[PDB]
Design a protein around this ligand. Structure first.
Ligand code: PHE
Ligand code: MG
Ligand code: MG
Ligand code: MG
Ligand code: MG
Ligand code: MG
Ligand code: MG
Ligand code: MG
Ligand code: MG
Ligand code: MG
Ligand code: MG
Ligand code: MG
Ligand code: MG
Lengths: 243, 835, 334, 49
RNA sequence: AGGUAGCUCAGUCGGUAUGAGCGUCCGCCUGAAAAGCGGAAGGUCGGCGGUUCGAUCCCGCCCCUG
């Protein structure tokens, strides 16, 4: 006979994915950093080396906050936590940050205006692109298995130089094993270090950022991203309690 | 799409093969090379394909068939050798003798479209004349494709005249590589990748510079408009009847630009080839001296499309003695516009301030092929070069004469050097950053390929980047050039040793414990939207001065009626509860752990703080203090059956006590004690609402929602809710040392009569205070009202367990402790022993 | 790399049982004197094959535990004798189960690394020491308060503890009738994961309870954690937004046909349109007939691409009724 | 009124102390190793010198 | 072109909302259900306003969807 008088609930799959990501980096000696969702333009853009009156900034899908001259906004990414961490902590710094980010994208099967990102930041003496690649590989092997590989190719972000995009390769994927775009990365821009009082000739660093809804989508094969954000209990319960 | 760049592979190969003859690569390998150096190939479009009799023809006659609604016409076409065919078409954009592309029976068109001889209308239609869309050549299906005069004689294979073996690449250029917004830039990048000699298409080595014997037009310029260079050169006596040749119109169409009159077609062709936006003016319509100046406070101006636009004091425009001529590098007006009436033109080549163009084209809400490139900086060194290229190409097609006069303005100081200042960088700086030992001379060679002159001096390089690379300003920028050309795949993967971290903070750990505890108790987590439902606080009937109404507002929400950011988590939860219920899931418990947004009077904007140094401590405090308060809340809602029905019984509906228990689940997860006191606080039921205290600090509310709120909001009847401010709950790190006596316990029950509105917790606390240390446990198990008790009274019965720490407690010792508890409850809550 | 999947699972089971009212105890490995005789176990019961300590602190307790229940039952009796009579306890610990291959290994030289066969020798010579999870319950499962008189512990509470452990382990679990001391032969389930037995649960035997001085109605569960396979699922749930059709079906079967078998037959015939099935009534009486029982299930149908009509749902309901008829002999209630 | 129909339980304090100790070293990059309670004299004594 | 009961839909072209279907509630049926019959409750006829003694109906503006 059925015996469950207190049916099990469920923590959200995105939250559980965040927890696994967090535990992965904690086990490597990293720590978790935090920042608010409503952020100043100073930290979301200016301190991150974004140019002003320039398409690299103005053509971002940004939720701006009234009044017109407030320079307040819903953060478009978790990268302003890079600025907050470097201002609040002594070097060296090895942190990640996981939180909500906001873009003006209509909710559909592959887009959601409210999503989650994992930000990574490492600032130390002698850090190089090879250390960035070692971290991404370990990150990939923990979220996708021992067969996971990472591919890096040049790109652009105002707060990194060089900048790159991260592709991931994992077995038992969608249409077989293939390269899937995962996130962005690069060496921390020296202007970012100078905007926090750090000598670029002594310290270097790398950063990265991946969206969790996107990661959960192509890893699990979730067709419709609407199910991740609408709160239907039928989407969450099959994932388990999460205790 | 402001970062797009379309171009045919044949044009790219042509520019590259000038320096490296016979260079040719597959489109797949070319795609992988572009991605390896940092150019996103969004789509690789091969043209065609066609098979069978697809040949160019010449329409011999057009017997127009009347009587129908649409202008249907029958056309006789020569497919070469004077073998005439009969085709029927409905297009009306071609005359007798125009060159067209026909598809004879047996041919196949993209995709899966076999042409056959079918009877239609009053004549026989063995074939058809094709359009640009039907041939997978252009994006125009409104009219039939008509080639320019002399493209190919009738009978030539259509796959060769249209170049259907070509492939067009659609690229998304990053905003730091505006020089790649052209064939000149992309061809240079490919020569760097394949280590090829490169001949600059904007170099004077192709054709000698056109002569300059005097100024071409009176021109005054304001200095603060930000323009760095302005060039003028007239071409007198053009044939308006002449059109552009096929190789030019084909490449123009494949790049997404539709051809018009040849005076404008050369401006767009040169813009695509060299990257310098080009604008053609009508010299006959120019009246007086030209001037570059900011606009007045309300000086309006009409564009070439006829739309007048209110200008700002920061807009850069050109204006003569009559009226305004153009808006900087945004768009030109109809005054100097070149038409079929025009014959004398005055070509302009100007570099505008990128920031000025970006502000104006964004405020006026009109981008353009010229504005996108000006926003990303244009190489000023090629202004006259592209101008001479544009004047020579125009006179060659329209049959004019290049005027030997030229006007050029290089600023208040005649700037001769357009290169950014030089950069000093250690020779092994790319090696250390990449973690790779590059071969000797790799950095200097790679920095030379991109156009920078380098001078070695010991272990330090002096790199002077070229004028088309204003993005190269620091050693880090030069590092990116070396690494991306050498290939990032050669960078090894080493795991850095991180120092001993401290793990999760107490707050991060508590957030997990609360999630685990609520999930195990049946609650399903949701991710709550911060955008409040429209009019939610009016549905709740909140007062006008309720602090929750003081919301932060978004200027550009996705839904116009939902711009306010949530000051409470309940509206989002209630929205998800309604969503589940409307889908047939009516027994639902949801929770959320998220921040809210609560602005104060101190919430305001902070002006830009300089980013060339670390902000001061007061500047850091300014930015923090200016943001709305964003505390972390935990909240939950319940509707329907709390316990489902099964073989055990009919289940149990959700009650306010279930919300009270959710409070205690959160309290236990937080390792804090909690008291619940009666309160009246919308949207809760005023008789079923507790305010939650930790010590003497309020931390939230719980209970059943107000029935009026439930009806107005379309909620399930009896819905309950809880919301707590996690940041108001203090962190606790207790170190218990429990007293565990092994001696026997004495069990006694006490039945106390109190007034009906005396809270049971107050009676229990009074009993506990009098019983002393011998009392180990107290539990209320009966609340009774009735005629045996009396009006306005109630009877509470507690189970008491007494135990001594060092001895077997006797019944008398326990009774003495029980009597002292009864005396305490009598003095504190007026309890009377039940008789 | 952090915690292994097994270490992480041990935590989840502890958190889940603790939140459900269970108090963890640290179980002693030294068995109570004559515990298996109190249980009335057969002479050849594998649990009697214990490892023995030569120098125990108590002379009459030298045998090492092959099961966690005796230690738990000892702590349950300790709590009850101290006036704490409504008690739920659990333990996560290894047992000691020697085999015929269990023997001593002579000294291996320590001036070098032992060979691979020497390492295998030492491992193979030790008794099997699998990790078990176990729990016991007595008295009131739900206490009394202003809501009602509480609810006494029942065998279904042990069945739910199994499902709490299964959910914490992210595995599916089936319970089948079994007779296995010290459990009540009519209130004992054997727990399977797939076709692999992993333990037992239910109410203890009344004869065992009396001989052992246990509270009446004591229930117990013991599972072998190492027999539960590790699972790393990646769900992708189908969430249709289209309306659901609600229908109930009342089926009459023989009284000894397990309700789970009837539900599985209903599910197998209903097809993909069936989203949820729930048993909410088990009825016997003269209206039904002797040796029979009536089960009533709540059915929720839903289509993935359209609003399901009543006829479409009824066709799916009729197919479920036909399936239950062929598989368990169910008869539609009239 | 009291509302807890399902009283809270408790993991053992020694186990919780072990968990905190474990988490401390995991956050430093260390890992957890395991071994049986019934052990050979080879590993308990002889191999340990 | 339409907006009409909680939802889905006909009707009423200035002076008692003509009505259905589902749903909800209520009786018959069942130990209790589902399904079925049976009956009831249930309509400022889109907001803002005019016109009129009086507007779901006619006039102005606007929300809404194809
Ligand atoms: N912030 C980027 C990702 C990124 C983070 C850090 C370095 C580079 C890229 C984004 O939101 O897409
Ligand atoms: Mg923007
Ligand atoms: Mg990309
Ligand atoms: Mg760069
Ligand atoms: Mg007594
Ligand atoms: Mg007594
Ligand atoms: Mg139905
Ligand atoms: Mg129905
Ligand atoms: Mg009609
Ligand atoms: Mg009616
Ligand atoms: Mg009626
Ligand atoms: Mg009724
Ligand atoms: Mg009404």
């Amino acid at each position: 006979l059925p015996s469950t008088r207190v049916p099990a609930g469920a923590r959200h799959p995105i939250i559980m994915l965040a927890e696994h990501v967090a535990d992965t980096f904690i086990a490597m000696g990293w720590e978790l950093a935090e920042g608010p969702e409503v952020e100043t333009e100073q930290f979301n853009f200016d301190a991150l080396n974004f140019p002003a009156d320039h398409p690299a900034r103005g053509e971002q899908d940004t939720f701006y906050i009234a009044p017109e001259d407030s320079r307040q906004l819903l953060r478009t990414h978790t990268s302003p936590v890079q600025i907050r961490t470097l201002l609040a902590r002594e070097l060296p710094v090895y942190i990640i940050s996981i939180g909500r980010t906001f873009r003006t994208d209509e909710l559909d099967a592959t887009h959601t205006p409210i999503f989650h990102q994992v930000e990574g930041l490492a600032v130390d003496r002698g850090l190089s692109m090879a250390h960035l690649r070692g971290t991404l590989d370990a990150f990939a092997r923990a979220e996708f298995g021992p067969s996971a590989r990472t591919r890096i190719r040049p790109h652009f972000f105002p707060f990194t130089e060089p900048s790159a995009e991260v592709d991931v390769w994992f077995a038992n994927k969608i249409g077989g094993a293939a390269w899937v775009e995962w996130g962005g990365c690069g060496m921390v821009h020296p202007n970012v270090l100078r905007a926090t009082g750090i000598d670029p000739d002594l310290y270097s660093g790398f950063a990265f950022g991946m969206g969790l809804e996107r990661t959960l989508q192509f890893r699990n094969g979730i067709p419709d991203m609407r199910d991740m954000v609408e709160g239907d209990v039928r989407f969450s319960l099959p994932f388990g309690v999460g205790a | 799409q402001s970062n797009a760049m379309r171009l045919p592979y044949s044009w790219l190969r042509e520019v590259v093969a000038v320096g490296a003859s016979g260079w040719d690569v597959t489109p797949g390998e070319l795609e992988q090379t572009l991605l390896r150096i940092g150019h996103e190939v969004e789509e690789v479009i091969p043209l065609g394909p066609v098979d069978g009799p697809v040949t160019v023809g010449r329409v011999a006659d057009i017997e127009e068939l009347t009587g129908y609604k649409k202008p249907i016409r029958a056309c006789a076409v020569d497919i070469g050798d004077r073998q005439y065919r009969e085709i029927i078409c409905g297009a009306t954009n071609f005359a007798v003798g125009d060159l067209v592309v026909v598809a004879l029976p047996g041919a196949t068109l993209p995709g899966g479209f076999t042409i056959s001889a079918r009877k239609a209308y009053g004549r026989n239609s063995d074939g058809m004349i094709c359009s640009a869309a039907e041939l997978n050549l252009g994006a125009d299906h409104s009219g039939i494709l008509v080639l320019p005069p002399g493209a190919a004689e009738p009978g030539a294979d259509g796959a060769g005249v249209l170049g259907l073996d070509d492939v067009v690449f659609h690229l998304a250029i990053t905003p730091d590589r505006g020089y790649c917004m052209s064939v000149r830039g992309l061809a240079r990048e490919l020569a760097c990748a394949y280590d090829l000699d490169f001949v600059d298409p904007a170099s004077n080595s192709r054709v000698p510079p056109l002569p300059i014997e005097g100024p071409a037009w009176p021109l005054t310029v304001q200095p603060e408009t930000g323009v760095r260079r302005f060039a003028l050169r007239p071409v007198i006596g053009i044939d308006p009847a002449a059109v552009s040749p096929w190789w030019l119109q084909r490449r123009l169409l494949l790049c997404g630009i539709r051809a018009t009159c040849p005076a404008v077609d050369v401006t767009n062709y040169v813009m695509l080839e060299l990257g310098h936006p080009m604008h053609a003016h009508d010299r006959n319509r120019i009246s007086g001296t030209l001037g570059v100046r900011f606009a007045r406070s309300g000086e309006t101006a009409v564009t070439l499309d006829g739309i007048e636009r209110k200008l700002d004091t920061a807009d850069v425009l050109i204006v003569d003695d009559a009226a305004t001529a153009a808006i900087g590098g945004v768009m030109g007006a109809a005054s100097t516009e070149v038409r079929a009436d025009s014959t004398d033109v005055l070509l302009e080549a100007a570099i505008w301030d990128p920031a000025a163009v970006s502000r104006t084209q964004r405020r006026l809400h009109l981008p353009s092929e010229a504005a996108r490139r000006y926003e990303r900086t244009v190489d000023p060194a090629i202004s006259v070069a592209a101008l001479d290229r544009c004047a020579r190409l125009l006179a060659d097609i329209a049959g004019g004469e290049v005027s030997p006069t030229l006007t050029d303005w290089r600023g208040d100081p005649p700037c001769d050097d357009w290169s950014p200042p030089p950069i000093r960088m250690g020779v092994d700086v790319p090696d250390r950053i990449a973690g790779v030992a590059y071969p000797q001379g790799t950095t200097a060679r790679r920095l030379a390929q991109i156009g920078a002159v380098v001078t070695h001096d010991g272990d330090t390089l002096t790199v002077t980047p070229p004028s088309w690379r204003p993005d190269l300003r620091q050693p880090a920028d030069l590092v990116e050039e070396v690494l991306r050309l050498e290939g990032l795949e050669v960078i090894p993967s080493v795991l850095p040793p991180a120092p001993a971290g401290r793990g999760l903070t107490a707050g991060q750990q508590r957030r997990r414990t609360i999630g685990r505890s609520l999930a195990l108790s049946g609650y399903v987590e949701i991710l709550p939207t911060p955008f409040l439902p429209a009019g939610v606080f009016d549905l709740w009937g909140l007062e006008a001065d309720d602090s929750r109404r003081m919301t932060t507002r978004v200027l550009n929400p996705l839904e116009a009626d939902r711009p306010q950011l949530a000051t409470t988590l309940l509206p989002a939860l209630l929205e998800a509860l309604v969503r589940n219920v409307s889908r047939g899931l009516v027994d639902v418990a949801l929770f959320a752990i998220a921040q809210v947004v609560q602005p104060t009077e101190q919430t305001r904007g902070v002006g830009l703080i300089p980013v060339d140094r670390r902000p001061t401590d007061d500047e850091i405090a300014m930015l923090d203090a200016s943001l709305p308060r964003q505390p972390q809340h935990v909240a939950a809602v319940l509707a329907g059956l709390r316990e489902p029905r099964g073989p055990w019984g009919p289940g149990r509906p959700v009650e306010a006590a279930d919300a009270f228990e959710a409070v205690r689940i959160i309290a236990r997860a937080s390792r804090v004690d909690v008291t619940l006191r009666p309160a009246q606080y919308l949207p809760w039921h005023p008789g079923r609402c507790a305010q939650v205290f930790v010590g003497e600090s309020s931390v939230g509310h719980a209970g059943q929602l107000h029935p009026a709120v439930i009806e107005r909001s379309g909620l399930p009847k009896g819905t309950c809710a809880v919301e707590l401010n996690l940041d108001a709950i203090p962190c606790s790190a207790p170190l218990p040392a429990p007293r565990v006596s092994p001696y026997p316990a004495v069990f006694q029950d006490v039945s106390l009569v109190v007034a009906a509105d005396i809270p049971a917790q107050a009676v229990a606390d009074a009993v506990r205070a009098g019983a002393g240390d011998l009392l180990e446990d107290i539990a209320l198990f009966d609340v009774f009202t009735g005629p045996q008790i009396g009006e306005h009274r109630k009877s509470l019965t507690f189970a008491l367990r007494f135990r001594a720490p060092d001895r077997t407690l006797t019944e008398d010792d326990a009774s003495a402790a029980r009597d002292a508890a009864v005396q305490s409850a009598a003095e504190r809550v007026g309890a009377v022993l039940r008789g």
